[PDB]
Assembly symmetry: C3
Homo-oligomer: 275 residues x 3
C-alpha cells in the first residue's frame, strides 16, 4: 500500500465513505504576548502565550502540498516574581510556564483531498514522533541599570490523542485535525540571570522558538470521512471577518482620549517652553 | 413515550433522519461591560452588555449531562444622564437598558446525542416557562464624595420563537439551539440613588445578575436532524482562534505609545525629586 | 426557461442536487481605519482598510429579498510621506492604496433558497459587469496650520473568478459566495492638497466611498448544491461570539492604567488652582 493511499469503504449515489492514510510534516511555532506596565519600565504586566498560525509549503513524493498549522497551549501554570514595591525594582506580575499538567494543541490542515470537504470523521488515529522544545533568551530591556535575561528551558513533547478542530483566522476557516501533545520536563532549566531565581523546570513564554523558524515533527494519520461522490464539490474556506466591532469602538474611543491627553501634555510642555 | 427519547424516522445507506425530544435546564447568565472615561472619575463612557458564556454540568434522570449556554441581548435602549459639562459632576454618557422593544437571545448546547452532528434541523419547537430577572446593586466608585449606587429594575422574560445558532469561542465552536425571549416591565423600577431620576421601568446593564451565579429556566425541545447512521462520526468542536490580528497590532502600538508617554511623565515627575 | 430557476438535476432518499441560477444586486461598501498618533496631532500612524459589512433589502421581480454583503481588500500597497522629523510637520507613517497587483473580495449572501443550506457547491460560475470606485475628500484635522485634504483617486473594478467563503460577524454566520475583482487604474489620480505629492494613481484608503451610501454592481450566478430533499431543514446562521477574551483583558488593563494616569495628571493640574 502507498504511503498516501485513498480508498473507498462504501459508496451510495451522492455520498461515499472515503478512507485516507497519509504522511504529514507538522511545522508549527509558538508565539508570545508581552505586555509591559507603565511608569518607568521596571514592571511587566503579562508574559503569556498567543495561538499562532503558520502556513508553509512542503514537498510530498513528487507533489507540492501547501499546509496551514496553528499552535496553542492549555493548562499552563502562572508564576510571578516581585522583588519590591518601589518603581525601581524589576517585577513581573504574571508569566506563563509549561509542565506535565499542561498540554500543547496543534491544529493541522493541507490542500490535499483529505481536507477538501471534511466535516465528518471516524476511525481516527495517528502515529507521531516526539520532539524537544527548547526556550530561548529574552533580554528584559530595563530603562536603566542591569539587563536580566530569561534564558533556558527545555521540555519534550510526546504524542497523545487526536481529535478534530476548526482553525479560525481573518483569511481562511479550516476544518482541521487536532493533534495533542503532553510534556515531560527535560534537564535544561530556565533561569532569570542577575536575579534570585534558577533551577526550575519548564519552558518560558517569552522566546519559546529559540530563534527558530518553526518546530518540525513528522507524522501519519488515518481516517474515514464523508465526501460527495462527485469529485467537484467545494466547502467554503476563505473568510471576511468583522467580529468585535464593540472592541474596535472601545479602542477608537481610547485612542481619541489618549490623543487628547498627549495633546494636553505636549501643550503644557510647549507653554512651559515658550518664554 | 419517554422524556428523553431517540427515534429514527427514516434511514438511508449512510445518513438517517432521527427525532430528538428532550428536557433541558437552561442555566444562563448575563455579563456587563463598564468603561470609565479618564480625567478625574466622575465621567463614564459606556455601560453595556457583552455576550456571556457559562458552561456547567447538571443531572438528568440518572445521567450527568454537561451543558454550555451563552446569553446576549439585542435592541436595547441607550439612555444617558448628564448633570453638567464640568469635571466634577456625575455623568454617564450612555448606558443600556432592556425593555419590551428589545429581545434576549440564549444559545444552548449539551453533550448528548441531539447535538453531536447537528447541522440540519426541522420541526423545531420548544415549550419554555417564563421567569423574572432583577437588577443588581452597582456602587459607582467615585474618586471623592458620596457613592451613587444603581439599584433596582425587574423584567419578566417571556418565551418566544426558537431557532438555531452557533456559539463560537476561543476554545470551542458549537452548533447550538437559540431560544428567543421577549420582555415585559414589572413593578420594581431601577434608579440611581442621590440623583433626580426614578420610577422608570427596565433592567439596568450595570449588574443584571443580582449577584446570582446564574438564572435558571426549564424547558423542552423537539426536533428532527440529519445524522450519519454510523454513530461514530464527530463534527469539529474545538478551535484555535487568531481573529482580529490587525486589532492585536493596533493594541500593541497603543501600548507602546502609552508606555512611552508614561515614561516621559514619570521622568518629568522624577527630575523634580532630586534636591 | 427562467431568470431565477431552481432545477433538480438529481435526487435520492434524503439528499438531492439542485441547480440554482439567479440574478443579484451586489451593493457593497468600503471602510477605512484612520489611526492618529499621539503628540500634537501632525503625525498619523496608519490609514488602513477594514472588512466592511453592509446589509440591505432589495426588490426582485415581485419578490422582496434581504441581502448581506461584506467587502474586503488584499494585496494593498503601503505608501508613506514624511515632511520632517519635527512634531510640527504633517507626516503620514502609512496609508494604504489599491492598484493592479491587488484584488478586491466581495462576499455576498441572500435569504433565498440557494443559500439556506449551501455547504457544498460545484459548477460555480458568474457573469459580472464592471463599475467605477472613486475616492472622496478626507480633510486632516490639523490643530493649527493649513488643512491638507486627501482627494481624488479612481479605479475600475473588473470581474474575476468566483469561489465560496464564510462571512463571520458578531451576529450572523453566512456560507456566502465570494466574487473577486481585479483592478485597472483610471485617469483621476489621488492627491493630498497643499503638499508635494500629486499625479500618482490608485485609490485612497481615507474616503473610498466618495460620500456614497454604497457601490452597486449587478450580477448573475449559477451553481449546483447538495440540499436535503425535505425543503424544511435550516442551517445555523445567528451567533453569539466571545472571541479574544485575552484581548479584552489586555484592553481592560490598559484602560485601568490609562485612567490612573489621567487621574494623576488631572490632580497635578488641579492642585495649582488653589489661591
Amino acid at each position: 500500500a502507498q504511503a498516501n493511499e485513498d480508498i473507498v469503504v462504501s459508496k451510495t449515489s451522492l455520498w461515499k465513505e472515503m478512507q485516507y492514510n497519509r504522511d504529514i510534516t507538522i511545522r508549527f511555532k509558538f508565539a508570545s504576548s508581552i505586555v509591559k506596565s507603565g511608569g518607568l519600565g521596571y514592571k511587566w504586566s503579562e508574559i503569556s502565550f498567543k495561538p499562532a498560525n503558520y502556513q508553509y509549503t512542503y514537498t510530498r513524493d513528487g507533489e507540492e502540498v501547501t499546509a496551514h498549522t496553528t499552535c496553542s497551549v492549555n493548562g499552563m501554570n502562572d508564576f510571578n516574581f516581585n522583588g519590591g514595591s518601589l518603581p525601581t525594582d524589576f517585577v513581573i506580575s504574571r508569566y506563563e510556564v509549561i509542565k506535565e499538567n499542561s498540554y500543547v494543541y496543534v491544529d493541522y490542515w493541507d490542500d490535499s483531498q483529505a481536507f477538501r470537504n471534511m466535516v465528518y470523521v471516524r476511525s481516527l488515529a495517528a502515529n507521531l514522533n516526539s520532539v524537544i522544545c527548547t526556550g530561548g533568551d529574552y533580554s528584559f530591556a530595563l530603562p536603566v541599570g542591569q539587563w536580566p535575561v530569561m534564558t533556558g528551558g527545555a521540555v519534550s513533547l510526546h504524542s497523545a490523542g487526536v481529535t478534530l478542530s476548526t482553525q479560525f483566522t481573518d483569511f481562511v476557516s479550516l476544518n482541521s485535525l487536532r493533534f495533542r501533545f503532553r510534556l515531560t520536563v527535560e534537564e535544561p532549566s530556565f533561569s532569570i540571570t542577575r536575579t534570585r531565581v534558577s533551577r526550575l523546570y519548564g519552558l518560558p513564554a517569552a522566546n519559546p522558538n529559540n530563534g527558530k523558524e518553526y518546530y518540525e515533527v513528522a507524522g501519519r494519520f488515518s481516517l474515514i470521512s464523508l465526501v460527495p461522490s462527485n469529485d467537484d464539490y467545494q466547502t467554503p474556506i476563505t473568510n471576511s471577518v468583522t467580529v468585535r466591532q464593540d472592541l474596535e469602538r472601545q479602542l477608537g474611543e481610547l485612542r481619541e482620549e489618549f490623543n487628547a491627553l498627549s495633546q494636553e501634555i505636549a501643550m503644557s510642555q510647549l507653554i512651559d517652553l515658550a518664554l
